[PDB]
Design a binder for this molecule. Structure first.
Ligand code: HAS
Ligand code: HEM
Ligand SMILES: [Cu+2]
Ligand SMILES: [Xe]
Ligand SMILES: [Xe]
Ligand SMILES: [Xe]
Ligand SMILES: [Xe]
Lengths: 33, 166, 554
């Protein structure tokens, strides 16, 4: 029928989970620097 | 349907790869960033520095616990740490702050971890190889060293200490 | 049975699985106790009464690591990635060589198991020198891993021969996968092969008395990292080509799955330095290089996320799937064959970002060898992969044996399958947390209770999870043993075709798929990137050998 709505929702959730995790530990890296 | 979704699926796959590539390049840009700064001091020296592990704590700078530390620059100190079966010499390692400390770590037996709690100091120690790292704790107090590589039945008990002075 | 005489490939496929599940079961027994150990609870004296031959925590972890991660996984790869091509092509594999690789596998398991169970090789699954096990463990390792070399040959045989009857036709999907898979596995195998033939074998036998640790754990990681993909792709195959069917839809793209499998073949091997970030003797630049390449090898998985997600949206819409989250509910949530792998994909999600972090060169130092790493992979192998294996018995088990599955074992599976995901999620929360809090892994921390006070709350979960996953396991032993020990047999569904999924294909496809089908060429590319990535360092290392003597610390 159309747009991968629920699929783009899933790869969005993934994208927020990579940033939360990666940026969150990119902080922890400098704070022990 | 089925074949009106295929082209759109192939279309939004194309932008994902474009976007995801970019975000990795963003990441390669921030890792390189950290490599250009001071915190980059923690990356183990690239050059090979072989030792005999059968003769490390009897001859050379490691042999003596009182000889562990040595002033090598104006504000640069070199500590000769030895990580062994369930412990570290010297204990405790004593070091001043605002000061750059060049750890030189090896082992006489097996592979041990060297994880200084509260810092980025995390390095594997290989018998017959010296791990060379650069760090400066802006923080004064009680630094503890952990073995994070399985090194024997007493591995969970193998602790150490960096005594850093305010 | 008439089954195993026209499809004896169904007989050799069955043995490969059970053998691996027996191991999986055995090795999984140490799981809970380690989940407890990491909740500050010391349950091992209890375990030592249960299993008298068990000597130490680290012997239990070694058996846990080896049996689950090496034996079970390899045997599963060898099963899925020989039988599935064979059935796609309806070609019988070389049964002579098929059995040989199994006997190698069984005898390689028996040889190796002896000193592990007698505590003469408590060196974990990475057997890092100078930690010196008994020769019979090392020898056992080599025979077992050499089993796959026959396997490689077997699938290649089936792929050369199919190319012959259909000259110039495109390699069919699954074969293509299994092919790049098996080739990719060959290229990687060399790192462990050389480590074995050049050091670990002559050393444990007595020929030499030194082994250099630095080169030993490098060659290792040459095989080291890609082996994780060798575990995984057998699920990816199943996720790509069987799952969309189990979901009620169609695999939305052929060229993508090929492209996925193509890249893994390219980049699975030249990245092992993302494990040795905390190693000395390796140039900083080379590390960044490998870190960039490790970032890139995250892509195939990223594609897979999109390609599969879609394949279950489309499959969900077909089921009468609603808006944004309706199709999710529209999938067959009563199906062990469907449910299991989807869950593992959910856990794969926090799994991936965990991998990506670890990959960021420097960021490793925050997490390297912490409890966070076990967090990472428990979401990948123990979650995604093992789940995909379990629920898969629900269509794979009837297909090879004729034994039907009751609505009881079907829901029993949902019970086992649901607990297992949950427990892993609990644990994932626990381990990563502890990992961020410096808690080391490979550690019997319950015998040093006060050593780690600042880990109060995550220690709860690992206890919690430990209970959780103890319950699922027994149910798994029971639920499986119920399925294997019932004489309920139907001869017809034992010849039923495997639930392969339809392949949505377009106009552009052909042109791209063909380029990818240049497998003979592609194999050279990945070979070259390896000499580029490791060669420089390796040769720098080989000219400066410092062999240290063997040690036993258990
Ligand atoms: C089977 C488990 C294996 C997988 C898979 C795996 C994934 C990665 N790993 Fe890893 N790994 C590392 C890098 C990566 C990277 C970059 C990835 C990537 O392949 C991850 C890619 C994944 C993604 C990018 C996520 C995609 C998400 C998907 C595909 C799911 C979407 C969900 C859907 C579609 C479902 C929706 C359904 C609905 C119903 C809505 C690094 C460093 O660079 C370390 C070093 C740690 C250290 O310090 O020693 C490491 C450590 C390990 C160890 C420890 C070894 C030891 O004992 O010393 C093991 C066993 C392991 C295995 C595995 N690893 N890894
Ligand atoms: C019954 C469910 C399981 C539980 C509760 C569990 C728990 C654990 C825990 C707590 C650790 C950390 C121990 C340590 O590093 O000191 C661990 C390690 C490990 N587990 Fe599991 N696990 C389970 C199943 C599995 C499965 C299914 C696999 C793979 C097929 C697996 C493979 C491994 C590996 C490779 C390690 C690392 C050992 C090492 O660092 O040497 N486990 N497991
Ligand atoms: Cu890896
Ligand atoms: Xe093995
Ligand atoms: Xe091996
Ligand atoms: Xe090998
Ligand atoms: Xe591994």
């Amino acid at each position: 029928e159309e747009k991968p709505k629920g699929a783009l929702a899933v790869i969005l959730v993934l994208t927020l989970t990579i940033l939360v995790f990666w940026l969150g530990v990119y902080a922890v890296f400098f704070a022990r620097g | 349907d089925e074949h009106k979704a295929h082209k759109a699926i192939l279309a939004y796959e194309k932008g994902w790869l474009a976007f995801s590539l970019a975000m990795l390049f963003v990441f390669i840009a921030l890792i390189a960033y950290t490599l250009a700064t001071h915190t980059a001091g923690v990356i183990p020296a690239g050059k090979l520095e072989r030792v005999d592990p059968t003769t490390v704590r009897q001859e050379g700078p490691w042999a003596d616990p009182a000889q562990a530390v040595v002033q090598t620059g104006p504000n640069q100190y070199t500590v000769y740490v030895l990580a062994f079966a369930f412990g570290y010499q010297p204990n405790p390692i004593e070091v001043p702050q605002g000061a750059e400390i060049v750890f030189k770590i090896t082992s006489p037996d097996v592979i041990h971890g060297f994880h200084v709690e509260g810092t980025n100091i995390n390095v594997e120690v290989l018998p017959g190889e010296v791990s060379t790292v650069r760090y400066t704790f802006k923080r004064p107090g009680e630094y503890r060293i952990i073995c994070n590589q399985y090194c024997g039945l007493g591995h969970q008990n193998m602790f150490g200490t960096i005594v850093v002075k305010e | 049975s008439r089954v195993y005489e026209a499809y004896p490939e169904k007989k050799a496929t069955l043995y490969f699985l059970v053998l691996g599940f027996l191991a999986l079961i055995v090795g999984s027994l140490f799981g809970p106790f380690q989940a407890l150990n990491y909740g500050n609870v010391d349950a091992y004296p209890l375990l030592k009464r249960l299993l008298p031959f068990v000597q130490s925590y680290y012997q239990g972890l070694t058996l846990h690591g080896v049996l689950n991660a090496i034996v079970f996984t390899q045997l599963f790869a060898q099963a899925i990635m020989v039988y599935l091509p064979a059935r796609e092509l309806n070609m019988r594999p070389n049964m002579g060589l098929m059995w040989l690789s199994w006997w190698m596998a069984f005898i390689g398991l028996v040889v190796a198991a002896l000193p592990l169970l007698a505590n003469e090789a408590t060196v974990l699954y990475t057997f890092y020198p100078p930690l010196k096990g008994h020769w019979a463990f090392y020898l056992g390792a080599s025979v077992f891993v050499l089993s796959t070399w026959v396997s490689i040959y077997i699938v290649l045989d089936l792929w050369r021969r199919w190319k012959a009857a259909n000259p110039g036709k495109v390699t069919p999907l699954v074969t293509y996968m299994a092919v790049v898979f098996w080739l990719m596995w060959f290229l990687a195998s060399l790192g462990l092969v050389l480590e074995a033939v050049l050091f670990l074998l002559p050393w444990s036998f007595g020929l030499v008395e030194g082994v250099d640790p630095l080169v030993a754990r490098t060659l290792f990681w040459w095989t080291g990292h890609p082996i994780v993909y060798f575990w995984l792709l057998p699920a990816y195959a199943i996720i790509y080509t069987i799952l969309p069917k189990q979901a009620g839809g169609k695999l939305v793209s052929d060229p993508m799955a090929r492209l996925a499998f193509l890249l893994f073949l390219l980049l699975s091997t030249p990245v092992g330095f993302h494990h040795q970030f905390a190693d000395p003797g390796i140039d900083p630049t080379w590390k960044m290089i490998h870190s960039v390449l490790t970032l890139f090898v995250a892509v195939p998985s990223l594609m897979t996320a999109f390609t599969v997600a879609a394949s279950l949206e489309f499959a969900g819409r077909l089921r009468g799937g609603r808006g944004l989250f309706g199709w999710i509910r529209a999938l067959p949530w009563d199906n062990p064959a469907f449910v299991a792998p989807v869950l593992g994909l959910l856990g794969f999600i926090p799994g991936g970002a965990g991998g990506i972090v670890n990959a960021s060169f420097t960021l490793d130092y925050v997490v390297h060898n912490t409890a966070w790493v076990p967090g990472h992979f428990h979401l990948q192998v123990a979650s995604l992969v093992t789940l995909t294996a379990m629920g898969s018995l629900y269509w794979l088990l009837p297909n090879l044996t004729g034994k039907p599955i009751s609505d009881a074992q079907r829901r029993l599976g949902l019970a086992v399958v649901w607990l297992w995901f949950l427990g892993m999620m609990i644990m994932a929360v626990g381990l990563h947390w502890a990992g961020l809090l410096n808690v080391p892994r490979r550690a019997y921390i319950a015998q040093v209770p006060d050593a780690y006070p600042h880990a109060a709350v995550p220690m709860v979960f690992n206890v919690l999870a430990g209970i959780v996953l103890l319950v699922a396991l027994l149910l798994f032993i029971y639920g499986l043993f119920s399925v294997l020990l019932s004489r309920e047999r139907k001869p017809e569904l034992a010849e039923a075709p495997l639930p392969f999924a339809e392949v949505i294909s377009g106009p552009e496809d052909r042109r791209l798929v063909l380029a990818m089908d240049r497998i003979g060429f592609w194999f050279a590319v990945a070979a070259i990137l390896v000499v580029l990535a490791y060669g420089p360092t390796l040769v720098q290392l080989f000219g400066h050998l410092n062999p240290v003597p063997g040690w036993r610390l258990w």
